[PDB]
Design a protein around this ligand. Structure first.
Ligand SMILES: Nc1ncnc2c1ncn2[C@@H]1O[C@H](COP(=O)(O)OP(=O)(O)OP(=O)(O)O)[C@@H](O)[C@H]1O
Ligand SMILES: [Mg+2]
Lengths: 340, 230, 284, 52, 52, 115, 86
């Protein structure tokens, strides 16, 4: 109950207009939950771009265990054709449980938590099918139909820890197999900071080579500002009349923290994210460091849409950044401050 | 390559994965587990690997092994078995990298059990102990300085902080493989050259150079060329 | 043991250590403000006491109750204290040193009248049983002479109505940034023990109209200036004692974290071996 | 000094009045956008639901 | 008189901006009403078409 | 969900949870270092937290045999109205026991009067 | 765990209380009777209802106010009363 599914299906919903096809695999989910999700997928956007694979908690362990491999075979079809795809595996812990049941009923020798000896080789061989693949491979697979494309299959496995134990066998296996995790802490979620991502423990091993340029330029300081807020949050609890350097830094940290939260089924395009981060990074919030920040963002997004949409088209197309874009973003922010 | 009479390096991308794969194979074969679920032959399967990696009357194999400690627990059997074999420990630090010092090796947490006077020699031993002591003292005075101000520092402690900043910078080095990032030529410092450089900085020669003279500069004789231009 | 409860204690001790480090931040910055205020107060009060030291000894002597070395029937103390905790033993050591002197007078049958400038003193001496005749509390981060005058005005009235014969202030001296000591200082009855002004014995001091009113005003200012410096110096001492205490509490919290972690790691390893042993035995 | 009393004060009324009207108008703009889009979604969602 | 002219200029804006905002919040309330209305209206269209 | 409950209900719930979470982290700090080393806005939120954590309690008709008191049924609307009033501080001046084991907030002010 | 699951209540006796000298070393708030008031005489029922809450909340206040040298007399009153009943 921290938003693991909410984050994944919002990821799927944001692919409505990218060429990235999407797959949601529901392992051991209860059927009425799946049905509620599927209805949300049609209502808030497109279920046309998503394949839904279902193995409910009432179905046999063999069907649960294999399910994710069947979904990977459906996504591995697009990868080998030259087209990008995104697969979400929901509860790889439930797949591990199903395999444990099958292994024990077949009498196979038990391991650390009764899980079988090859439980690593289950998820390892599942997830290492998620790859980006070169044009030579995709041209030799298709036998010369696509020629200059490079297919890919992005994967987002979901894991549930128990009371946040990160040293349990299945979590530590999957954390070694993958390359970055989005760690969703529970006491941030209880605090209402949803989505409750926890920086510093959540990393991305691929780095900023995956970011587009404008998102890369406007995000470097955010990481440092939140790091500085982590340490200066202890001081904020009980103390005041610190140095104004520190005071400024702490305040800005608390308001960038306030900025990085949003409603569930609102996804945000790169241009909208860009300008909101620019507003935080260039200091246009520094005088607005009060509870209105949510209204400020909604008003800024409405204003930007109303007056300067060809810029939003150009950024949503290119993600480019340069001095002319930097100046235009300044002009837009300067004008918006004069309004509400 | 050893039997041809060369000095080889063997890199192991993760030795923990070797141990854990040994657990998986042992569970598939069904043998009763021991300790924290590890295989019954843990120390033997480590010893069979690690004892082949040795110097010999012809050639040698040196090995640099990457080490993952499960659950941060230095007492867990895979760490505890591995550490019996390691002769040295190099720690890489995000903090040191953030300063821009490369290679980002923490000098205080890194160790070697070669670093004893009857093995390494007295001059090297006392130099290395000296640099360790200076950087440790500085690591304490930095806490004070922040807590109060540089005003508190005595003139001696200011000379400690200055020499420590020079030593810390003089640990950085330009690598031949890193030219693209840095654009610098790249250098290979001899053991005597580094011992002389740190001895000089510790005994207070070059106390008249600026600390940016030492950054990425290679040997100390190039530190004075840089300070000549600077 | 117990993995979740130990991991909960480790979390709580970690966060407590992080707070005691921040308190050490507030304590050092307040020490900066408090000691520069003291450095400003020091010249004026030091020269005022010098001035009276010159008046102590030299002729054309008028005769005045604060000036003569009368006999001791009872003794007055002005006691400064903190109102807060976490300052280590600064108040305890001062209160003990006073209790020793008050015992020495009680051996002589000389009673003690006590005026308290802090809540810790009020609590301690009321519950121990010293005659608290005046009290002010909660002066604030910036203390001001104006609020402190009333207790002094009471002690002055007790002297000048003739009941109270000897008067002291007890306070901690800011000997250094990291060293301080509790002191009992003789205050209002101007000690003839001080050096004779033989160095400028050409002068027998002479007066503008009404030496009584002028001199009375000047001694009122002297006593007050002495009390104000003694308070500002005790607040600088307080901030130094708090920073030392918080540093100790930070190191002791780290010492607990490093030992609770060893209990937790040994427990997780035993839990991992009790199971598995029982799954292999059950698999049979 | 007096002469300036009228002249200097001219900007306060002149500029304030203009800005006041401009913001007042800006609201009628927000209202028009919000309700014209409400009408658009009110028709798009009706047609969508009956095709589903 | 000059100082009085300065104060009234700072006032004017505050009244004007708070006066634009109430239009904006009225529009949001009316939008929530008219969107629910559209949803129910098409709903009744769906109910009859699916039963038929 | 704000969509399916009333949006005032949702806002009240988010407020209540945020406050109680903010109390929990303060608990061990007060236990070791003491209440005097809070700040005033934390001393405020620790009080409102205690008032909220009392107003969650309730007498049940089936738990009358155990405690010797009548049972109370609160309507949903009255519950929202009370917790919003407490968080907005309209009852900040009432003691904690004025909220303990009571029905609606009108009964909190009646018992407060008796207190 | 099994027997705690089967029975109609618990009396917990504790080493800390016994060494502290609270004998019988019963810990209230960790011990319950699910029959409760039905199994009492009417006098005992009447008098005992106040005791059950008073000791449980007293241990909470006694933990929460170890270090505050001065206190609110409402709380102070409760604290004393709890020591009396203990
Ligand atoms: N950004 C958000 N704002 C407000 N509420 C949210 C947000 N994201 C998620 N929620 C709510 O959080 C709750 C839990 O979300 P979700 O079901 O995704 O968590 P989960 O980790 O998948 O739980 P489980 O693991 O039990 O499936 C849901 O009620 C969801 O509506
Ligand atoms: Mg969920």
């Amino acid at each position: 109950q921290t938003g693991k599914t909410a984050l994944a299906i919002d990821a799927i919903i944001n692919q409505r207009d990218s060429g990235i096809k999407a797959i949601y695999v529901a392992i051991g989910q209860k059927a009425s939950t799946i049905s509620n999700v599927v209805r949300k997928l049609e209502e808030h956007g497109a279920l046309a771009n998503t394949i839904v694979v279902v193995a409910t908690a009432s179905e046999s362990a063999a069907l649960q265990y294999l399910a994710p491999y069947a979904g990977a075979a459906m996504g591995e079809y697009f990868r080998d054709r030259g087209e990008d795809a995104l697969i979400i595996y929901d509860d790889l812990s439930k797949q591990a449980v199903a395999y444990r049941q099958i292994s024990l009923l077949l009498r196979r020798p038990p391991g650390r938590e009764a899980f079988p000896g090859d439980v690593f080789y289950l998820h390892s061989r599942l997830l290492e099918r998620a790859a980006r693949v070169n044009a030579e491979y995709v041209e030799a697979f298709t036998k010369g139909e696509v020629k200059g494309k490079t297919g890919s299959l992005t994967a987002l496995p979901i894991i549930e820890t128990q009371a946040g134990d990160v040293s349990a066998f299945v979590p530590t296996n999957v954390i070694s197999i993958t390359d970055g995790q989005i760690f969703l802490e529970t006491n941030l979620f209880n605090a209402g900071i949803r989505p409750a991502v926890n920086p510093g423990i959540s990393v991305s091993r691929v780095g900023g080579a995956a970011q587009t340029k404008i998102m890369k330029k406007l995000s470097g300081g955010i990481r440092t500002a939140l790091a500085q807020y982590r340490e200066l949050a202890a001081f904020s609890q009980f103390a005041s009349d610190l140095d104004d350097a520190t005071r400024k830094q702490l305040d800005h940290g608390q308001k960038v923290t306030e900025l990085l939260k949003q409603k569930q089924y609102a996804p945000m395009s790169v241009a909208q994210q860009s300008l909101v981060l620019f507003a935080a990074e260039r200091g246009y919030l520094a005088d607005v460091e009060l509870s209105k920040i949510g209204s400020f963002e909604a008003a800024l997004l409405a204003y930007v849409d109303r007056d300067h949409a060809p810029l939003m088209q150009e950024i949503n197309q290119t993600g480019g950044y340069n001095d002319e874009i930097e100046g235009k973003l300044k002009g837009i922010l300067d004008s918006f401050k004069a309004t509400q | 390559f050893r039997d041809e009479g060369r000095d080889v390096l063997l890199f192991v991308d993760n030795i923990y994965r070797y141990t854990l794969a040994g657990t998986e194979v042992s569970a598939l074969l069904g043998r009763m587990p021991s300790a924290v679920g590890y295989q019954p032959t843990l120390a033997e399967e480590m010893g069979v690997l690690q004892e082949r990696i040795t110097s010999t009357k012809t050639g040698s194999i040196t090995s640099v092994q990457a080490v993952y400690v499960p659950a941060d627990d230095l007492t867990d059997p895979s760490p505890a078995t591995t550490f019996a074999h390691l002769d040295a420990t190099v720690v890489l630090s995000r903090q040191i990298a953030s300063l821009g010092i490369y290679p980002a090796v923490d000098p205080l947490d890194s160790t070697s059990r070669q670093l004893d006077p009857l093995v390494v020699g007295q001059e090297h031993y006392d130099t290395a102990r000296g640099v360790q002591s200076i950087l440790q003292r500085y690591q304490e005075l930095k806490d004070i300085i922040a807590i109060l101000g540089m005003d508190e520092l005595s003139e001696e402690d200011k000379l400690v902080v200055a020499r420590a900043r020079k030593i810390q910078r003089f640990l950085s080095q330009p690598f031949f493989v890193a030219e693209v990032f840095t654009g610098s030529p790249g250098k290979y410092v001899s053991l005597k050259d580094t011992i002389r450089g740190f001895k000089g900085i510790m005994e207070g020669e070059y106390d008249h150079l600026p600390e940016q003279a030492f950054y990425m500069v290679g040997s100390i004789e190039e530190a004075v060329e840089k300070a000549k231009k600077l | 043991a117990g993995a979740k409860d130990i991991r909960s204690k480790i979390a709580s001790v970690q966060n407590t250590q992080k707070i005691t480090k921040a308190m050490e931040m507030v304590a050092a910055s307040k020490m900066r403000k408090s000691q520069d205020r003291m450095a400003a107060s020091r010249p004026y009060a030091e020269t005022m006491r010098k001035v009276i030291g010159h008046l102590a000894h030299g002729n054309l002597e008028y005769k005045h109750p604060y000036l003569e070395d009368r006999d001791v029937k009872r003794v007055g103390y002005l006691v400064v204290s903190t109102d807060r905790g976490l300052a280590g033993g600064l108040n305890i050591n001062l209160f003990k040193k006073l209790l020793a002197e008050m015992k020495t007078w009680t051996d002589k049958g000389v009673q003690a009248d006590l005026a308290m400038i802090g809540s810790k003193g009020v609590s301690f001496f009321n519950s121990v049983g010293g005659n608290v005749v005046a009290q002010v509390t909660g002066m604030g981060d910036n203390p001001s002479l104006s609020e402190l005058i009333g207790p002094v005005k009471v002690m002055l009235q007790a002297y000048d109505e003739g009941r109270l014969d000897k008067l002291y202030i007890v306070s901690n001296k800011f000997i250094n940034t990291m060293s301080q000591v509790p002191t009992i200082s003789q205050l209002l009855p101007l000690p003839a023990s001080d050096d004779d002004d033989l160095k400028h014995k050409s002068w027998d001091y002479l007066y503008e109209p009404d030496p009584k009113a002028l001199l009375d005003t000047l001694l009122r200012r002297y006593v007050e200036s002495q009390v104000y410096q003694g308070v500002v110096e005790n607040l600088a001492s307080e901030q130094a004692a708090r920073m030392v205490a918080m540093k100790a509490a930070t190191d002791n919290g780290g010492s607990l974290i490093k030992e609770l972690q060893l209990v937790y790691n040994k427990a997780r390893q035993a839990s991992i071996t009790q199971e598995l042993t029982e799954i292999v035995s059950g698999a049979a | 000094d007096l002469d300036l009393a009228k002249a200097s004060a001219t900007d306060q009324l002149k500029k304030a009045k203009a800005e006041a009207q401009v913001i007042i108008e800006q609201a009628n703009k927000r209202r028009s956008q919000i309700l014209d889009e409400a009408k658009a979604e009110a028709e798009q969602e009706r047609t969508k639901i009956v095709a589903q």
